[PDB]
């Protein structure tokens, strides 16, 4: 599913989309709720395109 | 045959299984494995061999 279903950059989150907009809305809400004590937000990567 | 012969779904040809619980005595070396045959793949144990 790396080169066929998606482009490689979008699949590896090098240039595709921000974490808050490619994660599930439930997961985003959970990460926001538990950011104070468990901090899910580290594990996901943003593209930061120039 | 072009279709319905290969998975094209990220499947490994060869699998290496680590023993779940080995044990040795002065007589024999006993090893217990658990081999998972997956969900949509079939294995013939003629291919299996110990190492």
């Amino acid at each position: 599913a790396t080169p066929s279903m998606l482009p490689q950059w979008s699949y590896m989150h090098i240039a595709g989309q921000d974490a808050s907009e490619y994660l599930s809305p439930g997961l985003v809400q959970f990460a926001q709720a538990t950011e104070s004590y468990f901090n899910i937000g580290n594990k996901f990567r943003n593209p930061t395109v120039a | 045959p072009t279709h319905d012969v290969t998975t094209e779904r990220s499947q490994r040809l060869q699998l290496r299984f680590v023993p779940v619980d080995r044990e040795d005595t002065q007589y024999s070396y006993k090893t217990r494995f658990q081999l998972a045959v997956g969900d949509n793949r079939v294995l013939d144990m003629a291919s299996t061999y110990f190492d």
């Binding site: 950059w9 699949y11 590896m12 989150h13 090098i14 240039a15 593209p47 930061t48 395109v49 120039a50 | -």
Partner: protein, 97 residues
């Protein structure tokens, strides 16, 4: 002194813990992770040879260079079921071989 010898000044600099950087950008800035070039269609759609030459201050003992090519080294971890891990790696400009 009231009686010197003469000046002949010489200068040098000593920075010791830094890697020299030549950013792969058009303006040499870093306005983002994936640089201005690299997304450039010339460096994305075609293969190009590279040649680098270094002129150095000689030192007697045998030494060696160390060029670190700045690339994208990303790994995606996917765990579909219990007790199964599938991780896909991708280094974009220098992929495996």
């Amino acid at each position: 002194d009231p009686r010197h010898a003469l000046r002949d000044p010489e200068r040098k600099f000593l920075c010791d813990r830094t890697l020299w950087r030549i950013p792969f950008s058009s303006n040499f800035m870093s306005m983002g992770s994936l640089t201005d070039l690299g997304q450039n269609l010339l460096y994305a759609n075609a293969a190009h040879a590279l040649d680098m030459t270094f002129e150095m201050d000689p030192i007697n003992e045998p030494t060696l260079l160390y060029v670190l090519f700045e690339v994208f080294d990303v790994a995606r971890v996917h765990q579909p079921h219990r007790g199964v891990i599938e991780v896909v790696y991708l280094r974009t400009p220098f992929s495996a071989g």
